[PDB]
């Protein structure tokens, strides 16, 4: 999952 902008996973 995206690690550049974690809070974009929900």
């Amino acid at each position: 999952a995206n690690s550049n902008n974690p809070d974009w996973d929900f």
Partner: antibody
Amino acid sequence: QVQLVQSGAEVVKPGASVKVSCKASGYAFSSSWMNWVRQAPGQGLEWIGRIYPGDGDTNYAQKFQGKATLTADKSTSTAYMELSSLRSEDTAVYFCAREYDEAYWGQGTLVTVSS
Amino acid sequence: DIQMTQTPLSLSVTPGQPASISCKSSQSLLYSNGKTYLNWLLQKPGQSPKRLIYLVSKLDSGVPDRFSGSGSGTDFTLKISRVEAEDVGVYYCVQGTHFPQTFGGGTKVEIKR
């Protein structure tokens, strides 16, 4: 029912520093990332950085490294932001914002750097 | 930094007509993760931004089905099948795949009554 409320506008002489607050509520404060964004007069929106209240971890965009310091006070769920060595061009609106299942932005704070 | 450009800068349309806004990215917004991270924001005159779409075409909560997003990897477009008075404002596309997240210039939508 996520909600972010920021502090009022402020004026600061060039070179000084300013501290902007952002109270959070309706969601696990010390567990969610807190992003900070700047919106220039005519120039667009720029990402500044993010703090993780939990372990106080922080990231930044190369531009604001050393110019902006993010700090959180889990005791009151209030993430902060301090801006150093301000110039007149730093004048703008700064928002604090969440981006999970319920995105939300504070009403923004207008910081006028002027003599 | 992944640069994002929007088109047009301004848009004037009569009520009930359709409208499309495009965003180009320097590079692909497709991550190692099968998903491409891209949102659409709407900033009303005296308000703060509000997310309308994420993951290219996922409508947020309480968002009219008049809004829809599409796009492959470097070209994305927001489409309003039926423009309404309340749709006035400025729309922005935001990148989330690379670092750091970047915003598009924005497109101003004017209702032509």
